[PDB]
Amino acid sequence: ARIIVVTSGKGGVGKTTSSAAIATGLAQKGKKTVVIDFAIGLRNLDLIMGCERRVVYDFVNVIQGDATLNQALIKDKRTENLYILPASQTRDKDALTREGVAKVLDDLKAMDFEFIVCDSPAGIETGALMALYFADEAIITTNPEVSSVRDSDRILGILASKSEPIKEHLLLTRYNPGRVSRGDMLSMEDVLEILRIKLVGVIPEDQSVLRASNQGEPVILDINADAGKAYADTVERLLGEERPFRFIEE
Amino acid sequence: ARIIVVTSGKGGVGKTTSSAAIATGLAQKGKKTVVIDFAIGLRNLDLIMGCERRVVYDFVNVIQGDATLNQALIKDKRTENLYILPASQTRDKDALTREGVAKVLDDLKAMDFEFIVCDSPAGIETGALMALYFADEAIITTNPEVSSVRDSDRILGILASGEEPIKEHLLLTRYNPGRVSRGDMLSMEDVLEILRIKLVGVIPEDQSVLRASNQGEPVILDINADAGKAYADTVERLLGEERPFRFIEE
Amino acid sequence: ARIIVVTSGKGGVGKTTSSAAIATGLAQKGKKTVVIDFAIGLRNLDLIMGCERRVVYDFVNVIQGDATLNQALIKDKRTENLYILPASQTRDKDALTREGVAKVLDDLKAMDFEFIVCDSPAGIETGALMALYFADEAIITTNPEVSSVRDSDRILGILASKSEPIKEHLLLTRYNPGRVSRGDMLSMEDVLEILRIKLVGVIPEDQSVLRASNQGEPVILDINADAGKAYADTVERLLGEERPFRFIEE
Amino acid sequence: ARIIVVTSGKGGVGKTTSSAAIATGLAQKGKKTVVIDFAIGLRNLDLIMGCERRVVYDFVNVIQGDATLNQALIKDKRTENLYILPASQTRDKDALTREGVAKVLDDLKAMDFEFIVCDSPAGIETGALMALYFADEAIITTNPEVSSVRDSDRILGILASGEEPIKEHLLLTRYNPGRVSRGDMLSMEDVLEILRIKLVGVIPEDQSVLRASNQGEPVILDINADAGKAYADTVERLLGEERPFRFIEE
Amino acid sequence: NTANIAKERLQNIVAERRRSDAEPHYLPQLRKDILEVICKYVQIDPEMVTVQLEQKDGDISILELNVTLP
Amino acid sequence: NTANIAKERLQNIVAERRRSDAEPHYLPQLRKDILEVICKYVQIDPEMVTVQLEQKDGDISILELNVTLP
């Protein structure tokens, strides 16, 4: 089982959108996948997956033995092969213990999940550290913006102070080729020259993403959305298939 | 002295942009203002104010007596009457003490600051709780988006749980009237019917904001930017002047 | 502690060479020794000891409280038990106060120095008077030459206008037995019949002395140098051991 | 009248030998010359000129009006056209006044002296400063030795800190070509690369110099002495005649 | 053209971030403590007073610091 | 061959003496005061803790100091 953390440092770059679209895309490809919300007291994954109302037991409930993995897992109704483990809603920093999280991950491998997508919260503190700790891969989610690139670099410093190493990938999100050519936005290449890691995807700015979270329907399910198609390309690249980068030229 | 916290819960809604533009606008109006970065290990205020390279001592340095308020305060070079106290860069959650923050705030009142703008981090954890704790007013920063409205409501619950209570204001940010009328985006009124608080400003989606953080120049300084003008209106409303809401119709 | 001034009146007779070789020789014999440069504005001791580049604080810095004795003392790296206090570089006659010099000397006795070697400058003026003032012993350094013998006599007149008296010794330097027998140079006996004081050493003219100052290595450290051996004999005589005078016959 | 100071900083390099030999050489060439001892309390010029016993009145006696220039000047008996003004023997640093020295120099110009040779003492203090102050030219006297080259550089700094500046010349003294080629002694070129001034003479190490001061007979008078011949070359160069440098190769 | 300004501002910090992990935990603490202190006796803000660490092929270091005075 | 050692030792000083006249009477007083002070917290002797002043073609200066740590 491949444990993939979706991280960033900077808040509001597209971690949740990406964790959702990618977990769905992998499920569509017939790979049994679970996406876990690692947030502390803020439930945003269930809102984007559209299952905010089916949340009975959460990640912390399973760790403290108040519920089984079967009781807390929410099987997606729209896509076959997809499951969601939602976040706790306590203002509590601890809760998510290292031993606890490890026990949950082993149970999930035992349930034959191929992909365990960890939707990390913002920051460098507790929840974020816990989501990357057991990762095999990290998807560093970034915008062509100064705060986001600075905070992604801080996150790479934390992922690297671990010296099989965490395989790192850059997911450049909310890209706008037109803005890049008018000289108003950092280009894909500018971002790679700074955060020197392998590009795994480029998600264009798309008006389909607001419409997708409005409905609680991950953007990959909208077959006409450019952001959806770029997420399907990302999923291909995660499965080992080379794909040319679309939506980088106008 | 009016202590104003800029908060949100949700990451990447415009807290930093707003804290910067508002502190600047108040300074422009001749009011001696300081804007403080309450973040834990992520320095984003200095980046948006354009003084990332003049940062010698920070907020935690002053609390631990390694520096005076005079040594850590950065006087803005572009705008008269404006000062910046930057964030610490340690992963230490403890660092910011209640007693420590209170001592700093009293020293600032003693230095004759009229406005103390507290740029809060995301979340409901440590840094965010510390920024609102001593506030007289709170600017709840929100996008017309599902995750942001949910997380702003959680923050209102914390603000609400001796004296005149925290005066709350809604700063609706990244608004797009065209999107609202095509039925793709929650309207200003939809957001008010949910988070039932007084509207203090509406910041339109503006291509000037990316150009402003690229330069490290708060968007209110761009006299042609619609986001700049809407922030100048907000500053008027904070000073007690009624102003009609611009950029709400297309 | 024995305070020994190395004096002469005449310039360029071998005071510095002798102060250095003797201080080193005493250190070699396990006696904790310090050699002090009493010159005013000319630093020649540090050049001969080979520590011209480690000079941070000097004698006048210590007197004016700009540095501690520990900060100005240079511990020799080549010989154990040896220390150097270097000269000031101001054109200032005063500086070296009687009260100041006395305070330094008491601190050195307190640091358990057995031997305090005072490398006096030329002349009969300020620096030279200050170096002999607190002496317990004086080493009158002389060449078998007319100007040097005349100026040494003037210095004896000054040492004697003090009526435990200063113990005086003659250090006959740059001697050449071959020149003496061809009748071209005042003999050791001619010099004693004029300056009627106890002979403590005779340093032969030696090509090793130029090579020693070239390297910044006192000539006693060159175990093959005749001048080195004659300086080691001198050190024995200062420690109370009789030694036959070598290098007086050809 | 050309006022020439013979200076050095370092003691015992050959100032007196050079002042004497040069003043004599100029007198021999029919130029009416006076050589003045600027020393404070040490009479070494009269000893080398061989007139130590004809000294009645000195330089300070003339300044304080206790004697006329005619009463203090000693006409050399051995060489026509040569006169000596000897040094005072008081320890009084004040004695030599700027106004006093200037008055004496004007009287000497009025007596039709072509050359006024100022034999300066060692150091950078009073007597040395007074001898160079009114100079038209300076003869920096140096040995191929580390202390001497360091102290000559200090003197150049003082000479350099209205009219045509002091014309500076290097008189390299006690040179030994054999020692230079065996790599034991700084070469003429090494010394010029450090003290970057015009070479005016090179005086070889000569056993004739000790024999000359023994008799009180300047070394230029010994027609067989190499040092004498090199001083006669120097005198030619001072009179404007180019002469090849002898005694630089072995 | 603000994309170019963004790129330069970014490199100078991530070079800064790349650097902090090479330094010890005290050496940069002391420099900030005392070099900036020579403010009372000199007085300039950076405004670059540069700091650059180097190393030799012999497990040796070279902390050089430029002081560009206006 | 000690004439060569003498020559090198000499140039380092006369460069030092040639240098002292190029700058203010306080700037070198302060450096000696405080940079050597970081002895209590670091501890190394010069070891020419090098120091070099530079200038630009615009009445600007550049006091750089190298810190070669062993």
Ligand SMILES: Nc1ncnc2c1ncn2[C@@H]1O[C@H](COP(=O)(O)OP(=O)(O)O)[C@@H](O)[C@H]1O
């Ligand atoms: N490709 C995109 N185009 C347009 N808006 C986007 C895109 N990706 C994300 N967004 C918007 O950016 C915001 C942040 O998305 P989100 O996934 O919630 O961020 P995060 O998980 O990092 O906090 C949301 O308001 C979302 O609508």
Ligand SMILES: Nc1ncnc2c1ncn2[C@@H]1O[C@H](COP(=O)(O)OP(=O)(O)O)[C@@H](O)[C@H]1O
């Ligand atoms: N009015 C606006 N129009 C367009 N983009 C905006 C606007 N306000 C903010 N942004 C962008 O949204 C992102 C988040 O802004 P920021 O102020 O850093 O968020 P926060 O401080 O709340 O975490 C940035 O990329 C910023 O450029």
Ligand SMILES: Nc1ncnc2c1ncn2[C@@H]1O[C@H](COP(=O)(O)OP(=O)(O)O)[C@@H](O)[C@H]1O
């Ligand atoms: N024994 C000796 N043989 C040869 N040269 C000597 C001897 N002693 C001293 N010298 C030389 O004589 C000069 C004066 O030596 P120095 O110690 O500097 O004199 P001072 O301290 O009295 O001014 C130097 O150039 C030195 O090389």
Ligand SMILES: Nc1ncnc2c1ncn2[C@@H]1O[C@H](COP(=O)(O)OP(=O)(O)O)[C@@H](O)[C@H]1O
């Ligand atoms: N060319 C030379 N060859 C040999 N010995 C010399 C030579 N020049 C000077 N000396 C000797 O060097 C010593 C210093 O000479 P002196 O002229 O008295 O020095 P100063 O006047 O500079 O103090 C004397 O002992 C002198 O005999």
